[model samples]
Target: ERDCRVSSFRVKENFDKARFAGTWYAMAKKDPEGLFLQDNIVAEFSVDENGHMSATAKGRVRLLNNWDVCADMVGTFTDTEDPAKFKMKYWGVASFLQKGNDDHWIIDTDYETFAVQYSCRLLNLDGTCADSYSFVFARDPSGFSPEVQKIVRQRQEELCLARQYRLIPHNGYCD
Candidate 1:
């Protein structure tokens, strides 16, 4: 089995919040044990006056009855000692799908083309992750260049999330 210990990871250095704030398309995802955000995902990030980060996201969620509906969610990030790491409190706009507070880490990004994000939902007795997720965000909804794809995949491996990612579709279902 692969070791996915949280301690083995690192975050972006010299992080700039202003440059990071913008609309980002979910190009790919490495979901945790359970399902949450599915496809056609898009998120807009913001940095307030005090430099606090917050996000608003939308995605298409699949229900048990095989019906799919669009979902809007919000997240607020609390700063950590590390500038690129945050504790995110997220909630669904719907009355049903409500809240979660999870670690949000910006592992890598050029702040223009793509971003590599990771969140370990659970930690095991051995320190390896019990559950986790990753998001590969791109500025373009259609896609990014192959060069960007290569770098993004490398960042995923650097985050100890090898082979865990799957392409996230931008089907215009939520648009």
Candidate 2:
């Protein structure tokens, strides 16, 4: 069991960017305050020869309560001393969407099956996360095996967000 401190969370050790480079379908997500992306969340990660990691993501977001559009986002990650954590600067394909930098951490992944990503936007005075978001991604949009799903659940609990995730639907809405 974790104490729910953002600083105390464990992340994937020796995360390799090259191995992580691929298309990832968001199986589930825990929304942050003022959520921007809603559903059909899919991401493509890539790594350059210089070890720079970048990604492009697409998803649906409702803007005016009646109008929903697919939002395309591009992100670049800056490395830290820890191999699993990075500073992510992301922007939308259009100029109107929100853009900013956030901490992107690879919480866990096995390269070919599943990956857990976390970002803590704000920290409380008590060392807890005031605002946070997480994504549970899969190599195949079809989903995971029971054994892999169990491992995903365990990682969710470790992040103290086992109950907060909402299933992300993929229906070719963006394609």
Candidate 3:
């Protein structure tokens, strides 16, 4: 059997790329120290009319900043089935390379609550998996109540994973 620890981090063999081609909102995050903390953040990924994937993400300390402080990003998918590998570019105020790579490995994805796990594989200057980062997302940012979020977090924690709460802005968009 594959080590549960390693298996927990393994990229699933099969995933539906089409189903993942839509907007998503952040629900929680796992800190670098393996601790979970409540946060206010928003993110979305969509496929443009040209069939290229685009994404936008933002985080703030307060609820109001959720929309105003939004950080935008645009990118295309390299491999969707993998769920842990993709490429992206930031097209907001900041300017940098037009094409960079990103990966999204699912820690878990539950359609009932519209929730999923998102991990970004890290790389060294030479581009290697030196480490990884994780976050949780939902179809609607405000889909889960505080109590429900806690319940889900508990279940995830029992499995030895961190669970941080993300205060999803309740703008008209999600409804």
Task: Evaluate all candidate structures by whole-model CA lDDT and list the values in order.
Answer: 0.87, 0.92, 0.49
Which parts of model 3 have CA positions greater than 4 angstroms off?
A: 1-13, 32-40, 48-52, 61-69, 80-91, 96-100, 120-131, 143-160, 163-175
Global lDDT of model 3: 0.49
Q: Over the stretch 28-118, how does candidate 1's per-residue lDDT look in tens digits?
A: 8998875588999999999999998999999998866767889999999998889988999998888777588999999999998899998
Q: How accurate is candidate 2 locally (lDDT)?
A: 0.92
* Per-residue alpha-carbon lDDT of candidate 3 for residues 1-175, written as tens digits (9 for 90 to 100): 3222433444434554555656666765554423122244566667655556566654432123243333334544655545544544444434521234545554445544544454444444543334544566777656577766775675456334544433444443322
Lowest lDDT sum, 10 consecutive residues, model 2, at 61-70
Q: Which stretches of candidate 1 lie over 4 Å from their true place?
A: 1-3
Arrange candidates, best lDDT first. Answer: 2, 1, 3
The window of 10 residues in a row where model 3 has the poorest summed lDDT is 61-70
* Candidate with the greatest TM-score versus the true structure: 2
lDDT of model 3, residue 172 = 38
* Model 1 TM: 0.93
